[PDB]
Design a protein around this ligand. Structure first.
Ligand SMILES: Nc1ncnc2c1ncn2[C@@H]1O[C@H](CN(CCCNc2ncnc3c2ncn3[C@H]2O[C@@H](CO)[C@H](O)[C@H]2O)CC[C@H](N)C(=O)O)[C@@H](O)[C@H]1O
Ligand SMILES: [Mg+2]
Lengths: 202, 238
């Protein structure tokens, strides 16, 4: 089902096996860095335990990282069974194309991992640098969706820890700030009803 | 405006469209030791002869990927960098754009550092609007990892992509490093004639001349100058 789909849920507890296999996984995990944080975070062990391996046979993972998650995110990436083959840099600008501990941070990083042997992807159409305006805090650029679509047109994709503004055609979005469940793919709907007959994910 | 779609359409990299301290540089210039340099084949050379222990190490091994004597990450990882680094000390490691982003982090941890910054050299192609097999994307940047051991600037360098076969790194990296005021013992491993610079000891296989003397070099940091940051005034003599 081409149109946007999503599932409001705690990604620690959802049985992601009901969702099938995807050509692309993208995640923007709420890494446990520093302290406080305006949102809920996942511990390092919770991140390691995420059932990412069931989501793909052959495809690409896009994993946003920052701070010490540059190292932890590599750990998870490898643990989940991927090899990191690229690293996207989002250069953060204002509306006039000016860039916004030891150094000021002009950018954020997206690790690119490969699993299996993906075939029929259009490797090399885009470059590994995004220049795009900052929006709300932690809002990632929409350019990444176009890069991923040109890389793998028409295929099914899943985003982890997406917010409502993240839902896109051809994507299933999971996150705990989404509004309810919106599923249209009949195969997914069937397996969702079989696994969660009372619609209670817990 | 979607610069990624634009690059796909025109070949102009998104970074082509990014639109773009004095007294400090003078203090750095004052405290700088004279340039010192040594020709050494680092594979065969006992780096322990490089004394005293360094406050900053810039490590620029010539990777195979720069050309399209090369050093593999196998070679680099076996360097005994921890033997010449001061207990509190910094490293800056040019890791390229491939497997080095992973293996360079292994090196840093192997040598006792933790990464505190990831400095990205972003290469524009405004003058000329081909990939490694695993590459998913066109690679238009390189990474210099900053590491720390013991207890003004941004993490981006944007310059036009150099001519093919030119493996020089942007001189801006030296300005970032020197602006941190990290100490005055600075070593540049795999530097070249063209990178020799006041305030730095340059060691590399292609150097055509040497002037390094361990005793003379150490004399620059003898008391009262042992702990200067390289950003303060000279200590007055006589
Ligand atoms: N177990 C769990 N299960 C399921 N979701 C969980 C969760 N645990 C936390 N999540 C959710 O994963 C998302 C993580 N973001 C990164 C931080 C954004 N969030 C906030 N940023 C600032 N100020 C805020 C925020 N929220 C209240 N105030 C993805 C952002 C997204 N990529 C974007 O582009 O917008 C969040 O939606 C998180 O709630
Ligand atoms: Mg300067």
């Amino acid at each position: 089902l081409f149109p946007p789909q999503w599932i409001c849920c705690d990604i620690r507890y959802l049985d992601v096996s009901i969702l099938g296999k995807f050509a692309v996984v993208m995640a923007d995990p709420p890494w446990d860095i520093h302290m406080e944080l305006p949102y809920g975070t996942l511990t390092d062990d919770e991140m390691r335990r995420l059932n990412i391996p069931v989501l793909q046979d052959d495809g690409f993972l896009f994993l946003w990282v920052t701070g010490r998650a540059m190292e932890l995110g590599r750990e998870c990436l490898n643990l989940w069974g991927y090899e990191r083959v690229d690293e996207i840099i989002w250069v953060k600008t204002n509306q006039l194309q000016r860039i916004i501990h030891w150094l000021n941070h002009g950018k954020e990083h997206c690790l690119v991992g490969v699993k299996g042997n993906p075939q029929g992807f259009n490797q090399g159409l885009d470059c590994d640098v995004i220049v795009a305006e900052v929006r709300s805090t932690s809002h990632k650029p929409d350019e990444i969706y176009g890069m991923i679509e040109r890389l793998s047109p028409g295929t099914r994709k899943i985003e982890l820890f997406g917010r409502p503004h993240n839902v896109q055609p051809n994507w299933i979005t999971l996150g705990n700030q989404l509004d309810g469940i919106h599923l249209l793919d009949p195969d997914v709907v069937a397996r969702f009803k079989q696994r969660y007959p009372d619609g209670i994910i817990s | 405006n979607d610069y990624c779609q634009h690059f796909v359409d025109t070949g102009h990299r998104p970074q082509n469209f990014i639109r773009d301290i004095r007294l400090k540089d003078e203090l750095i210039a004052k405290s700088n030791t004279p340039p010192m340099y040594l020709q050494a084949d680092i594979e065969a050379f006992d780096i322990r002869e490089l004394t005293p222990k360094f406050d900053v190490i810039l490590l620029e091994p010539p990777l195979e990927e720069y050309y399209r004597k090369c050093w593999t990450w196998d070679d680099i990882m076996k360097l005994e960098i921890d033997e010449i680094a001061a207990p509190r000390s910094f490293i800056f490691l040019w890791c390229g754009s491939g497997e080095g982003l992973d293996l360079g982090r292994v090196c840093l941890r192997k040598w006792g550092y933790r990464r505190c910054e990831d400095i990205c050299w972003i290469k524009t192609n405004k003058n000329n609007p081909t990939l490694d097999p695993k590459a998913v994307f066109q690679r238009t940047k390189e990474h210099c990892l900053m590491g720390i051991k013991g207890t003004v600037d941004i993490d981006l360098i944007i310059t036009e992509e150099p001519e093919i076969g030119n493996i020089e790194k942007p001189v801006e990296i030296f300005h970032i490093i020197e602006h941190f005021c990290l100490g005055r013992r600075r070593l540049h491993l795999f530097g070249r004639d063209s990178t020799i610079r006041p305030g730095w000891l340059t060691v590399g296989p292609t150097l055509t001349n040497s002037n390094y003397n361990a005793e003379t070099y150490a004399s620059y940091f003898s008391a009262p100058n042992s702990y200067l940051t390289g950003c303060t005034e000279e200590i007055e003599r006589l």
